[PDB]
Amino acid sequence: KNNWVLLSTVAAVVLGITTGVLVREHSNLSTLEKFYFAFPGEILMRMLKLIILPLIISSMITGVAALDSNVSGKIGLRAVVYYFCTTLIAVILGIVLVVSIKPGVTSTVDAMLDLIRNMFPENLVQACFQQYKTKREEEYKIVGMYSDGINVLGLIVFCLVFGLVIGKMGEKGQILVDFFNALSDATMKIVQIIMCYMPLGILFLIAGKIIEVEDWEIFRKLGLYMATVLTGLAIHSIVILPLIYFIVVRKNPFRFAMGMAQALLTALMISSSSATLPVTFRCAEENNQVDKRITRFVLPVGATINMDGTALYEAVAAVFIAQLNDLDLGIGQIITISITATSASIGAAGVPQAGLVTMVIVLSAVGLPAEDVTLIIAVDWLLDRFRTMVNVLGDAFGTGIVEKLSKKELEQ
Ligand SMILES: CC(C)CCC[C@@H](C)[C@H]1CC[C@H]2[C@@H]3CC=C4C[C@@H](O)CC[C@]4(C)[C@H]3CC[C@]12C
Ligand SMILES: CC(C)CCC[C@@H](C)[C@H]1CC[C@H]2[C@@H]3CC=C4C[C@@H](O)CC[C@]4(C)[C@H]3CC[C@]12C
Ligand SMILES: Cc1ccccc1Nc1c(-c2ccco2)nc2c(Br)cccn12
Numbered sequence: 001k002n003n004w005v006l007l008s009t010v011a012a013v014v015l016g017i018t019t020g021v022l023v024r025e026h027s028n029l030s031t032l033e034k035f036y037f038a039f040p041g042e043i044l045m046r047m048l049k050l051i052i053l054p055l056i057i058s059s060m061i062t063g064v065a066a067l068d069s070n071v072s073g074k075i076g077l078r079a080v081v082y083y084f085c086t087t088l089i090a091v092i093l094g095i096v097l098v099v100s101i102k103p104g105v106t107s108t109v110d111a112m113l114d115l116i117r118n119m120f121p122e123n124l125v126q127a128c129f130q131q132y133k134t135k136r137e138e139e140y141k142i143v144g145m146y147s148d149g150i151n152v153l154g155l156i157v158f159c160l161v162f163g164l165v166i167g168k169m170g171e172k173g174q175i176l177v178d179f180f181n182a183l184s185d186a187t188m189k190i191v192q193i194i195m196c197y198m199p200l201g202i203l204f205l206i207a208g209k210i211i212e213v214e215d216w217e218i219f220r221k222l223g224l225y226m227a228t229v230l231t232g233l234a235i236h237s238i239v240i241l242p243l244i245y246f247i248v249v250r251k252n253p254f255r256f257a258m259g260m261a262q263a264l265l266t267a268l269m270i271s272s273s274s275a276t277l278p279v280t281f282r283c284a285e286e287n288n289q290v291d292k293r294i295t296r297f298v299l300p301v302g303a304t305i306n307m308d309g310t311a312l313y314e315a316v317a318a319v320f321i322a323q324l325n326d327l328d329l330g331i332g333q334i335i336t337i338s339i340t341a342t343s344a345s346i347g348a349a350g351v352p353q354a355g356l357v358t359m360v361i362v363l364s365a366v367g368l369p370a371e372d373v374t375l376i377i378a379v380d381w382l383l384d385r386f387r388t389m390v391n392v393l394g395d396a397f398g399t400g401i402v403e404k405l406s407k408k409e410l411e412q
Contacts, residue, residue: 005195005352006271009381012202019203020210029211038208044201045370047194048360051187052150053128056347056361058184060156063304063349064163065177070300075409078402079298083305086244086394090236090311091338097232098316099334103224104324110134110142111332115339117144121154128155131365152365156343188350195352205374218324222375225320229383232312237390241308245397249404253397259287260396267392268385274303274350276392283396290399291410298402302395304349307342309387309394310358315341318362321372340365355384 001007023029029037071080114134121127131149134142166173213219242253257264263283267276280299284290318337322329344361351357356377363370403410 003269006381008199009202009353009377012199013206013378016203016206017210019207023207024211034208034211037211038204040203041201041205041208041374042371044194044198044205045360047197047201048357049364049370051191051194052152052357052361052364053155054183054187055191055351055357056152056155056344057159058180058187059349059351060159060347061163061166061180062177062184063346064160065167065180067301067304068164068167070297070304072297073409075294075297075402075406076301078405079301079398080305082398082401083302083307083394086241086398087305087307087311087342089240090232090308091315091342093236093240094232094312094316095319095334095338097228098319098323101224101228101231102323103228103316103320104221107136108330108332110136111330111336115153115332115336118151118153119157121151121158124155124158127151127158149367150361150364152340152343152347152361156347159347188352191351191357198353198356202377205371206378209374218375221320221324222378225317225375226379226383228320229313229316230386232316233309233383233386233390236308236312237393241390241394241397245400248401251400256288256397256400257393259283260393262287263392263396264389267388271381271385271388272350272354273306273388273391273395276388277303280392280396284399288396288400290403293410294399294403294406298399299395302391302398304346306391306394306398307345309391310341310345311338312390313383313387314345314355314358314362317359317376318366318368321363321368321376322366324372324375325368327368337362337366353380353384355380355387 023037070076114132117132117134121132126146127150129148129150130146131151131154133145133147135145137143166176169176242257245251245253245256260280260283263276263280266279267273270276277299281295284295284299285292315338318341319329319334322333322337327333341358341362344358344365345354348354348357348361356373359373359376359380360370363373
């Protein structure tokens with residue numbers, strides 16, 4: 001019905017819980033038998049991990065090269081600055097809520113430097129399956145290591161520089177742009193094939209998790225995770241973003257949101273910001289009367305670099321999974337998670353189920369068990385819909401900001 005992706009995921013979740021409760025109470029499997037029961041779920045995890053490397057590399061180069069076209073002049077610069085500030089506040093807001101609420105609960109300088117080191121790997125081939133970690137030994141020295149763990153930060157940064165370089169090379173770099181455009185297109189087709197197998201893998205992933213839960217405390221922790229994500233998205237969409245619009249534009253932001261209601265409603269159903277653009281353009285220019293020039297240079301940019309939703313959904317999810325693993329975490333470790341979350345999303349911007357694919361990238365890069373994402377998919381459909389609604393609203397408000405900040409340019 002063109003919504004099989006949503007129906008299949010919910011059906012898999014519902015049947016996964018039904019299978020888990022029945023098997024747990026009507027059977028007593030051993031440790032080895034329980035592992036085999038989740039094997040279809042394990043195979044799904046390998047497919048998602050397998051497609052990470054071509055997805056992020058092809059998409060980041062494709063997106064960055066395409067972004068070079070949209071981001072031109074001062075008008076484009078206003079949107080880039082606007083999306084940096086709103087994303088920055090979302091990153092801080094997400095960390096404050098997950099650290100204070102503490103959903104799944106019960107050196108900082110080294111982590112920060114390791115973050116910069118990973119952004120500049122010493123070998124691109126090794127960056128696909130290894131990450132750099134440092135330690136303090138004893139008067140105290142520093143010892144690097146290099147351990148298994150795809151270096152998403154290094155690959156994304158290089159693709160950023162690579163994408164910008166080829167985009168500016170004109171015709172000499174067109175073959176590289178065409179090559180990675182087709183590779184990106186092919187990878188999305190491959191993920192669609194994996195998405196067809198997802199309902200079977202999700203069924204056994206969730207079902208196996210129900211067999212292994214000793215106490216219902218995990219369900220309570222999942223509820224706090226939903227509250228943390230919903231609370232952060234609500235505050236950003238209701239308080240922070242309208243406040244930013246109000247001060248810069250000195251107009252009522254709530255009226256501005258009414259014109260986008262058609263786009264906001266479409267954002268939930270489709271659950272993709274890029275696919276909602278045609279509706280977003282119509283609402284922004286017709287209902288909000290925003291100049292058509294701004295919407296052309298702002299909305300395409302916002303569909304790529306608007307990470308407010310990721311900073312409030314995927315970053316919070318990664319820290320929540322870390323807290324589930326009894327990791328004490330720190331300022332340096334949380335900042336590493338937050339940057340990884342935004343880097344993963346930009347590399348998986350148009351992938352079906354960005355939320356699932358992005359989280360698997362974040363967990364793999366950070367080091368948390370990629371199988372702990374099972375709890376995320378149980379409500380990912382619900383939270384991903386709200387995440388996209390905030391992203392579209394952020395871009396819609398961004399168009400009003402750039403118009404007010406670039407009135408003189410429009411006159412000229
Ligand atoms: C240190 C962290 C923030 C990453 C480093 C980011 C900065 C230093 C990097 C990221 C992408 C890079 C750009 C990539 C492509 C080009 C095109 C080239 O014709 C001139 C240099 C220029 C414009 C680079 C300048 C340096 C740059 C802006
Ligand atoms: C993903 C990790 C490494 C964080 C990097 C995030 C930020 C710093 C990166 C991600 C993609 C980048 C953009 C890629 C392409 C362009 C087009 C260019 O004409 C102006 C800069 C601009 C708009 C870049 C600004 C910096 C940017 C927004
Ligand atoms: C739009 C922009 C311009 C310049 C620098 C950063 C950004 N935007 C951004 C991203 C991002 C964009 C794509 C992938 O990640 N991540 C973060 C974080 Br964490 C914290 C703050 C901002 N951020």
